[PDB]
């Protein structure tokens, strides 16, 4: 879950 | 919203690691002991028959 949340956060940063 | 979501994920991960560490350390400790009021003796003569 943490990995998925971090991936979403780093994808939506741009 | 994403900050709150990743904070929830981090909190879940840290509580899960704490739980697994606690279970691991509990699973190996010597919880219960057998105290010996009188240790086994070495007989000299025969009680039976």
């Amino acid at each position: 879950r943490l990995q998925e949340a971090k991936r979403q956060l780093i994808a939506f940063q741009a | 919203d994403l900050q709150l979501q990743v904070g929830f994920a981090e909190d879940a991960y840290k509580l899960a690691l704490a739980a697994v560490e606690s279970a691991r350390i509990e699973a190996t400790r010597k919880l219960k002991s057998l105290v010996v009021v009188e240790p086994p003796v070495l007989p000299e003569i025969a009680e039976y028959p």
Binding site: - | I25, T28, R29, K30, S33, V35, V37, E38, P39, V41, P43, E44, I45, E47
Partner: protein, 126 residues
């Protein structure tokens, strides 16, 4: 009594006083056989030489009497002998060994916890 309900340890002492484990230490420290074999005049109440270990334990249990008071929770010990000084010394040794055993019972449970804590500290340090 516990140094900061307690029938368990008095029962432990009641069992421990009449045990061969205490008798071995008592005979090694006070030479019970030599003292109890002295009165050659009467054969009914003396410890004959060459007797078995089991008979020695039976004789020692006959000489030392332990009584319980449950309503008051007190243990009274009467020790027989052929000299008064020897009887007093045997009673004192019995009390000292009883206290030492009572403390050692908890120290044994504590030592394994200490070893376990040391191992946990070692792995945490690593």
């Amino acid at each position: 009594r516990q140094t900061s309900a307690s029938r368990e340890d008095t029962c432990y002492l009641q069992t421990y006083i009449h045990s061969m484990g205490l008798l071995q230490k008592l005979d090694q420290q006070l030479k019970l056989r030599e003292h109890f074999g002295t009165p050659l005049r009467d054969p009914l109440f003396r410890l004959w030489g060459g007797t078995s270990q089991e008979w020695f334990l039976e004789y020692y249990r006959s000489r030392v009497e332990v009584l319980m008071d449950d309503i008051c929770g007190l243990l009274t010990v009467r020790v027989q002998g052929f000299e008064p000084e020897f009887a007093q010394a045997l009673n004192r040794a019995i009390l000292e060994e009883s206290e030492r055993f009572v403390n050692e019972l908890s120290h044994r449970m504590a030592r394994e916890q200490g070893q376990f804590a040391e191992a946990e500290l070692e792995r945490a340090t690593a």
